[PDB]
């Protein structure tokens, strides 16, 4: 059964032969990707815990696994707790793991590729004030030679080695989709280095979405984002342009038309694994010895390996200027995002149309969560310029809808019931990235269900149309999405909205709508709006749109902003509690539903082959105006 006690008792020996006392294993990769590929999942092979968020301290005593609160009920069900000590991380306890590992051992090791500098420093600075007497000697271990050694050891290669290789080639993201040339974007980044960042002439881009966005390239190295393993190094020459641009990537996956076009900036192209020896040997020795000058600017979550090549005093950890660059879409991008959402609405329509028909036949109740998940994914795949799903589809019936990130498996699959059904799904298109949730009911809704839905919907409708002065902090917008739940002493354990990339990652930084951290929003930022509520062992609801920031009104004194919709799919009338709904909400519902009918109905009618009249009747039905 791929035994862990076996692999653990095996590991404890390899730690021993290396004189390595305490070993930290974390689920992540060297690009700080939310979703990691298989080659990077080490934790699961040792614990049988396949959950994405987790950290593994491996010691002489009983190993400890930290996981996030959202993954806990899966870790109890997965992780055997006789072999491994289980523990949860919460917003409460966050630093507990730092406290813990401070509480045990004179030799410690880390995967240099799989650890962020953030984790490392917080730990290292936990052990500074833990044991002021002990001296910390940090070392990068190259080619399993430990014979040169508080020892902090950054490991070049993992002690856990492993999976499919991707041979598919990179492709250009055409200007018609992205609205701006790679050259223009690189010229903007150039301007940032002149004006904004004057204390650094060297910048490394480690975030894959930033590199893809800037070069207008996409790739196949990840299942849910069209990204590709890469680094992009910039070296600035003050007296006022780029000295060199070095692109590290998988060269065999580099097509011919892209290489010649990479003679346009005269970009040097290296292989991916050469980033470390190139920085170590070529870059760093070249940098010469009131106002402080830094050797290099790295992203905040840059992997430990790349970081340790420098002297910490000379590294500057901050966002790339690309972060703000991508957070504000240009109009071509917005227009393209609208087309992607239009295509998605058509796909949702087919999916729920099909559900509804099978609901009548009652064949819907021999279906499973997995079956329904493949169907919506299918309907999206028949859409023009569709690449693949933008994340793993959440298809959850009844009680499983209370599990926020719930994943059906061939193993974990449930029969569809005449109950709450939650569908969180999205797609990657040449036109953009989409993320949408709708909650519906296949049975007779209970009073509690309607009420929970409507209280979630009220927060959601409010955030669709909210009018706010331009200075307003986005944490205020997060609050009004929760108000109606607050009034009932109810809350949801996640953020209200995140930024979203154009054909990049479904979760993009640079802006958000959430309770902790927040900033003012700018026009043509794209954000999700997704309040929810979750009742364990019963059901849950989430309602999610994507929308973008528009200018609502400008007076002599003040600029007011609002949002406009990207997502076009209606809400569920069977779940409405009309005792909770003001007429302004009902009109807003009606105005939205009519906009949907105006948009999608003419597209439906002209592909009667693909859609047909049962579909348009269904569309007309779910968009019919509600009575005041």
């Amino acid at each position: 059964d791929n035994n862990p006690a076996a692999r653990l008792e095996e590991l404890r020996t390899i730690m021993k032969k290396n004189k390595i006392d305490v070993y930290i294993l974390i689920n992540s990769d060297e690009h700080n990707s939310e979703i990691i590929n298989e080659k990077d999942k080490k934790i699961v092979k040792i614990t049988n815990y396949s959950g994405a968020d987790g950290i593994l301290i491996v010691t002489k005593d009983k190993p400890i696994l930290y996981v996030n609160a959202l993954y806990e009920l899966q870790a109890m069900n997965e992780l055997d707790q006789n072999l491994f000590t289980l523990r949860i991380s919460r917003i409460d306890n966050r630093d507990e793991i730092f406290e813990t590992i401070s509480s045990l051992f004179n030799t410690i090791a880390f995967d240099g590729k799989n650890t962020s500098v953030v984790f490392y420093e917080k730990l290292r600075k936990a052990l500074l004030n833990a044991y002021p007497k002990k001296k910390i000697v940090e070392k990068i271990i190259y080619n399993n030679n430990f014979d040169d050694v508080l020892n902090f050891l950054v490991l070049e290669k993992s002690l856990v080695e492993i999976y499919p290789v991707n041979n598919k080639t990179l492709y250009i993201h055409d200007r018609k989709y992205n609205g701006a040339c790679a050259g223009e974007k690189i010229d903007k980044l150039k301007q940032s280095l002149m004006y904004d960042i004057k204390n650094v002439d060297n910048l490394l881009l480690s975030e894959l979405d930033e590199i893809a966005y800037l070069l207008n390239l996409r790739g196949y190295d990840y299942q849910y984002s069209p990204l590709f393993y890469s680094y992009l190094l910039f070296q600035f020459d003050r007296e006022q342009d780029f000295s060199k641009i070095v692109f590290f990537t998988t060269v065999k996956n580099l097509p011919a038309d892209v290489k010649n076009l990479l003679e346009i900036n005269k970009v040097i192209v290296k292989e991916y694994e050469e980033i470390v020896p190139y920085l170590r040997d070529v870059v760093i020795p070249s940098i010469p010895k009131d106002f402080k000058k830094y050797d290099i600017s790295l992203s905040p979550y840059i992997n430990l390996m790349i970081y340790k090549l420098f002297d910490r005093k000379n590294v500057l950890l901050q966002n790339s200027p690309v972060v703000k660059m991508k957070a504000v879409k240009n109009d071509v991008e917005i227009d393209n995002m609208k087309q992607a959402h239009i295509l998605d609405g058509l796909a949702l329509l087919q999916f729920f149309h099909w559900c509804e028909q099978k609901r009548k036949t009652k064949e819907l109740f021999n279906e499973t969560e997995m079956s329904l998940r493949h169907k919506v994914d299918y309907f999206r795949s028949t859409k023009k310029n569709f690449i693949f799903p933008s994340f793993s589809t959440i298809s959850a019936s009844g009680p499983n809808a209370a599990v926020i990130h719930y994943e059906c498996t061939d193993k974990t699959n449930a029969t569809i019931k005449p109950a709450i059904y939650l569908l969180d799904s999205g797609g990657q298109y040449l036109h953009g990235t989409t993320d949408v949730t709708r909650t519906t009911h296949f049975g007779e809704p209970t009073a509690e269900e309607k009420r929970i839905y409507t209280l979630v919907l009220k927060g959601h409708l409010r955030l669709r149309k909210v009018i706010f002065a331009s200075y307003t902090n986005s944490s205020a917008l997060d609050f009004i999405a929760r108000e109606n739940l607050f009034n009932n002493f109810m809350d949801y354990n996640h953020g209200t909205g995140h930024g979203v990339g154009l054909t990049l990652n479904v979760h993009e930084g640079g802006c958000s709508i959430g309770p902790v951290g927040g900033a003012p929003l700018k026009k043509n930022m794209v954000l999700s709006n997704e309040p929810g509520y979750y009742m364990k062992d019963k059901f849950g609801v989430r309602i999610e749109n994507m929308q973008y920031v528009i200018s609502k009104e400008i007076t002599d004194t003040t600029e007011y902003l609002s949002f406009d919709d990207l997502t076009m799919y209606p809400y569920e009338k069977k779940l409405l509690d009309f005792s909770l709904l003001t007429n302004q909400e009902i009109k807003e519902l009606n105005e939205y539903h009519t906009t949907i009918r105006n948009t999608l109905l003419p597209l439906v009618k002209q592909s009667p082959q693909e859609y047909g009249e049962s579909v348009e009747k269904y569309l007309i039905e779910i968009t019919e105006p509600i009575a005041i």
């Binding site: 994340f391 995140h498 709508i513 959430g514 999700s528 929810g532």
Partner: peptide, 4 residues
């Protein structure tokens, strides 16, 4: 899904 949720930003968390």
């Amino acid at each position: 899904x949720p930003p968390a």
